[PDB]
Each structure stands twice: as C-alpha cells, then as structure tokens.
Amino acid sequence: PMFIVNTNVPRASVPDGFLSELTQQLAQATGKPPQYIAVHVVPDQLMAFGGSSEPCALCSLHSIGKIGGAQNRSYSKLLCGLLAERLRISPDRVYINYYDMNAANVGWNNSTFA
Amino acid sequence: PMFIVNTNVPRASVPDGFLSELTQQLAQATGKPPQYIAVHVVPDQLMAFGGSSEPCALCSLHSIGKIGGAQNRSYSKLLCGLLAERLRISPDRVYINYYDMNAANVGWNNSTFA
Amino acid sequence: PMFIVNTNVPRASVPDGFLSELTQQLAQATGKPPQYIAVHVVPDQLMAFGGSSEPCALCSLHSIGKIGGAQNRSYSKLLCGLLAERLRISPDRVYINYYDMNAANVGWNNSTFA
Ligand SMILES: CC(=O)Nc1ccc(O)c(-c2cc(NC(C)=O)ccc2O)c1
Ligand SMILES: [Cl-]
Ligand SMILES: [Cl-]
Ligand SMILES: [Cl-]
Numbered sequence: 637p638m639f640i641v642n643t644n645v646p647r648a649s650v651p652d653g654f655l656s657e658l659t660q661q662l663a664q665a666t667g668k669p670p671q672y673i674a675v676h677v678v679p680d681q682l683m684a685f686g687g688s689s690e691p692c693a694l695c696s697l698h699s700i701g702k703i704g705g706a707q708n709r710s711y712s713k714l715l716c717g718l719l720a721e722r723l724r725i726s727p728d729r730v731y732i733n734y735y736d737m738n739a740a741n742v743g744w745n746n747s748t749f750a
Numbered sequence: 751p752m753f754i755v756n757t758n759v760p761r762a763s764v765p766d767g768f769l770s771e772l773t774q775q776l777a778q779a780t781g782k783p784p785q786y787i788a789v790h791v792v793p794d795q796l797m798a799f800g801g802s803s804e805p806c807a808l809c810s811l812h813s814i815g816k817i818g819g820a821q822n823r824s825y826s827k828l829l830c831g832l833l834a835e836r837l838r839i840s841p842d843r844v845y846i847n848y849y850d851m852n853a854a855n856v857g858w859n860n861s862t863f864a
Numbered sequence: 865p866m867f868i869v870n871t872n873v874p875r876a877s878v879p880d881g882f883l884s885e886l887t888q889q890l891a892q893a894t895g896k897p898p899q900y901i902a903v904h905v906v907p908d909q910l911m912a913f914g915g916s917s918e919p920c921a922l923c924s925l926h927s928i929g930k931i932g933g934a935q936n937r938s939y940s941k942l943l944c945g946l947l948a949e950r951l952r953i954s955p956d957r958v959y960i961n962y963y964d965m966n967a968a969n970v971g972w973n974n975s976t977f978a
C-alpha cells in the first residue's frame with residue numbers, strides 16, 4: 637500500500653518519525669506488513685480548500701484490497717486523527733482519495749502482483 | 751472536488767490570485783459549492799511534454815459526479831484557457847485526467863462522503 | 865500517456881536527459897507517439913518504503929489503452945530497469961500504479977480524446 641499527503645503546512649511542522657508512525661499505523665489498520673507500506677509527505681505546498689490557504693491536506697491511499705465503504709471511514713478517522721495531532725490540520729480540511737488497485741495494475745520489482 | 755496542477759513554470763510566474771480564480775471557475779463549471787473545492791498548484795517541476803521542456807502541465811480533477819463526456823470537454827476548454835491565460839501554458843502541452851469518484855472513496859472529516 | 869516518478873533521490877542524481885530518455889522508451893513500449901508522452905520526475909522527496917528511507921520511488925503510468933496483464937508486467941520490468949540503472953533505485957523499492965484511461969476522461973488541447 638502507499639499513502640501520500642500533500643499539505644501547505646511547513647516542513648518544520650512535520651515531526652521526526654512521522655513517516656514511521658504512518659507506516660506502522662497503516663500496517664496495523666490494513667493488516668499488511670509494514671515492509672510493504674510506502675509513505676510520502678509533501679509539505680509547504682501551494683494549495684487552498686474552500687478558497688482558504690489556511691492549513692489543509694490532500695491525500696490518497698492506494699492498496700490492493702482492504703478498501704471499502706466501512707474500511708475507508710475507519711481509515712479516514714485514523715489518518716485525520718494523525719494529521720490533526722501531528723500536523724495540526726483540522727479534519728474538515730482534509731481530503732483522502734481511496735484506491736482499491738487490481739493486483740495486475742500495481743507494478744513492483746520488475747513485475748506485477750497478478 | 752479536488753483540482754491539482756503540476757507545472758514546470760517558475761513559482762513567481764503563478765499569479766497570487768490563481769488558486770482563488772480556479773476555485774471560483776470550478777464552482778461555476780461543476781456546480782459544486784466553492785467551500786468544498788480544493789485546489790493545488792505545484793510549480794517549478796522537472797517535466798517534459800513531447801520530449802521538450804517548454805511550459806507544460808499535468809492536472810487532475812477529482813469529483814463525486816459532474817464528470818462525463820460533455821462536461822469533461824467543457825472543463826478542458828475552461829481549464830486550458832485559464833492555464834494559457836495565467837501561466838502562458840499552451841493548451842497543446844496540457845493533460846487533464848478526470849476522475850468520477852465514488853463518494854465512499856473520498857475521505858474527509860474523519861469519515862467519507864458515503 | 866504520462867509517467868510520473870516521485871523519489872527521495874537528490875535532484876543532482878537525476879541524470880541529464882533522463883526525461884527525454886523516458887519519453888523515447890515509453891514511446892516504444894506503449895507504441896504511442898512521443899508527441900503525446902508526458903514525463904514528470906520529482907526528486908528530493910520525503911518518503912519511506914517499508915519503513916526505510918533508502919532510495920525508493922512511487923510512480924504512475926496513465927494511458928488510453930495499452931494497459932493490461934502482460935503489458936503491465938512488461939512496463940514494470942522496463943521502468944524498474946531504467947530507474948535502477950539511471951537513478952540507482954532498487955526495484956524492490958519501487959511501486960508503479962497503472963491506469964487505463966477512457967478517452968472521455970483525458971483532457972488535452974481544449975478538448976478530450978473522446
Ligand atoms: C511472505 C508473506 O506472506 N508476505 C505477505 C504477508 C501478508 C500479506 O497480506 C501479503 C500481501 C501483500 C500484498 N502486496 C501489496 C503491495 O499489498 C498484497 C496482498 C497480500 O496478501 C504478503
Ligand atoms: Cl519522518
Ligand atoms: Cl468495507
Ligand atoms: Cl485498478
């Protein structure tokens with residue numbers, strides 16, 4: 637799985653180990669080994685939510701399976717919780733797009749997962 | 751909805767009112783409330799279009815509904831126009847991927863829109 | 865078609881001409897005209913893969929057609945190869961999400977490909 641967070645908060649706002657926290661929490665949440673989890677955080681972005689340049693974030697979670705209505709709500713609660721606590725971004729200013737990828741459409745190590 | 755623009759033009763070439771104009775124009779075109787439109791512009795990127803590096807842009811518009819044949823054609827004309835007018839990016843060096851998101855796959859405020 | 869590479873490797877480590885290179889190779893691989901191929905490389909990113917911060921990359925290949933079971937296995941072999949050789953990123957630390965786009969959902973030059 638891979639989780640990407642794009643945000644306008646400054647780099648200094650991202651605590652050391654934040655990437656590791658995301659990795660471990662997502663492993664726990666998705667059930668997949670942390671070793672398969674990739675995380676990417678992009679601060680100091682030029683973005684707005686509702687026209688407002690106050691702190692916000694646009695994210696995406698891609699995963700082969702383990703993506704569904706109820707599961708996504710749980711992921712959102714977890715992820716929004718982390719962003720609020722660690723980056724001080726209000727949950728109502730956070731979007732996370734979820735993607736349930738077919739194993740044939742995810743490349744890794746010279747091949748796919750199909 | 752959410753609109754992202756990745757471009758190689760210098761940050762100083764991006765008008766300060768661009769995120770606001772994109773927000774207003776997208777509200778106007780999609781019919782979606784502006785308070786829920788998120789916009790993100792990422793300048794100074796290392797990109798190529800057709801193998802060359804003159805100004806170009808790769809974008810994506812994610813929306814729960816309001817995505818389709820005719821709508822996408824109108825958005826493309828609207829957005830290419832704005833990119834040409836404000837960033838001097840030729841329409842022929844712009845790609846816009848449209849995504850009709852299921853509400854269940856859009857996280858926000860500790861939940862989803864479904 | 866468009867190919868995007870996000871990596872934590874330094875900008876200085878991205879070889880000169882790498883984008884034009886990718887354009888040519890993707891042209892042959894997909895069979896599409898170079899004029900329609902867009903490439904985007906994002907170095908110096910804050911990311912982790914498997915909880916490790918060693919060189920890694922998260923990539924996307926979007927195309928109208930030319931996406932499938934064996935085609936994606938072949939693209940993976942090729943792209944992981946070029947990344948390994950040119951950016952020195954190990955293939956076990958690279959993910960590539962493949963997207964088969966409907967022509968109606970791809971905007972370009974004030975219109976769509978529908
Ligand atoms: C040796 C071994 O058992 N590894 C393992 C363990 C638990 C899993 O859930 C998967 C697993 C991993 C993926 N790979 C990705 C990227 O999700 C997909 C489906 C899976 O069941 C793989
Ligand atoms: Cl970190
Ligand atoms: Cl579910
Ligand atoms: Cl898929």
Ligand SMILES: [Cl-]
Pocket residue numbers: 686785
């Ligand atoms: Cl408002």
Ligand SMILES: [Cl-]
Pocket residue numbers: 795796875
């Ligand atoms: Cl550069």
Ligand SMILES: [Cl-]
Pocket residue numbers: 817818819820821822
């Ligand atoms: Cl339509």
Ligand SMILES: [Cl-]
Pocket residue numbers: 850851852855
């Ligand atoms: Cl969706």
Ligand SMILES: [Cl-]
Pocket residue numbers: 931932933934935936
């Ligand atoms: Cl195939």
Ligand SMILES: [Cl-]
Pocket residue numbers: 964965966969
């Ligand atoms: Cl599509």
